[PDB]
């Protein structure tokens, strides 16, 4: 298992899925077409702002 | 000023060379959903009108 | 292929692949039945010879 982690805007979380496109998907973190995994996210305003 | 949606505006665009990458690259759009045409290949494609 | 991104171009092409495979296997079957008819006229033509 490979665990990946990062912070993004709450608007941008929609890009973290297979077959998505956009600045994050295109140039920051690209998922393959046949991705087997799970995408976990939570609001971190109190943590990261 | 934009149209009221009950009176939605329309204009024909024709006899020109596009660059939809300018639109795709711009950050302000909160939605960019393309149906039956895909936003990347959109800039490689060509249309009558 | 000129118009759609891979992840959904696959879905459109999968329809053409199913339809064209079903089209072709129907032709192949009807040729096997026709071949089983001409074979019986070739066995009769050989017998009359």
From Swiss-Prot, chain A:
Effect of residue 11 to N: In strain: Omicron/BA.2, Omicron/BA.2.12.1, Omicron/BA.2.75, Omicron/BA.4, Omicron/BA.5, Omicron/BQ.1.1, Omicron/XBB.1.5, Omicron/EG.5.1; complete loss of interaction with host integrins
Region called Integrin-binding motif, residue ranges: 9-11
Subunit structure: Binds to host ACE2. RBD also interacts with the N-linked glycan on 'Asn-90' of ACE2. Cleavage of S generates a polybasic C-terminal sequence on S1 that binds to host Neuropilin-1 (NRP1) and Neuropilin-2 (NRP2) receptors. Interacts with host integrin alpha-5/beta-1 (ITGA5:ITGB1) and with ACE2 in complex with integrin alpha-5/beta-1 (ITGA5:ITGB1). May interact via cytoplasmic c-terminus with M protein. May interact (via N-terminus) with host bilirubin and biliverdin, thereby preventing antibody binding to the SARS-CoV-2 spike NTD via an allosteric mechanism.
Functional summary from the UniProt entry: Attaches the virion to the cell membrane by interacting with host receptor, initiating the infection. The major receptor is host ACE2. When S2/S2' has been cleaved, binding to the receptor triggers direct fusion at the cell membrane. When S2/S2' has not been cleaved, binding to the receptor results in internalization of the virus by endocytosis using host TFRC and GRM2 and leading to fusion of the virion membrane with the host endosomal membrane. Alternatively, may use NRP1/NRP2 and integrin as entry receptors.
Protein's name according to its UniProt entry: Spike protein S1
Boundaries of the shown chain within the full protein: 395 to 443 of 1273
